[PDB]
Design a binder for this molecule. Structure first.
Ligand SMILES: [Mn+2]
Length: 185
């Protein structure tokens, strides 16, 4: 909205004290009221926009198998057929701060969430990552309980959370998520 610089100062103040945690995850999720999911149409529109516009970005794809057991998220690798082949990550996600972001009418809703993922149901995640600088666009096709949903979120990529997550970086995260939020149809 061009004055989202104002709301980024409030975000920085609320999560400044958490930057020292080495396992900080900072995410902006797209959704609708809150279910962090977009339509398959808009999912393909967002994918086309990001595949075309960022020339200096990198991309990868990974097919995952997540299981929530005793509060710990067990991440499994997958074969060509898509069945779990060995566990690759044991993580527990603790949520530190979360607030939804005001978006224009008709746009997708935005959920800002600061989390911690400390190393230690069934979700098959077909995730496509496009990494432009300090921003990772995660387009996932999640099947949980026999339902396929399309998730889009922007993650923070940092070498130093303390040195690099600044108020300026939060402004750009809002501007980038809002560009995708206004792609709702
Ligand atoms: Mn994430």
């Amino acid at each position: 909205d061009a004055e989202q610089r104002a709301v980024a100062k409030a975000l920085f103040d609320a999560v400044n004290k958490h930057l020292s945690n080495p396992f900080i995850e900072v995410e902006m999720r797209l959704g609708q009221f809150f279910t962090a999911c977009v339509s398959t149409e808009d999912y393909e529109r967002i994918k086309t926009y990001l595949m075309t516009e960022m020339e200096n970005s990198s991309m990868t794809r990974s097919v995952t198998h997540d299981v929530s057991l005793r509060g710990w998220r067990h991440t499994y690798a997958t074969d060509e057929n898509g069945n779990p082949t060995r566990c690759v990550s044991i993580v527990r996600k603790k949520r530190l701060f979360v607030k939804n972001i005001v978006v224009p009418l008709g746009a997708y809703n935005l959920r800002f969430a600061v989390s911690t993922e400390t190393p230690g149901h069934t979700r098959l995640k077909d995730r496509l990552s496009i990494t432009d600088g300090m921003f990772r666009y995660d387009m996932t096709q999640v099947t949980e309980k026999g339902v396929l949903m399309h998730e889009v979120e922007i993650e923070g990529v940092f070498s130093s959370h303390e040195k690099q997550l600044t108020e300026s970086w939060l402004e750009e995260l809002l501007r980038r998520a809002m560009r995708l939020a206004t792609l709702r149809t």
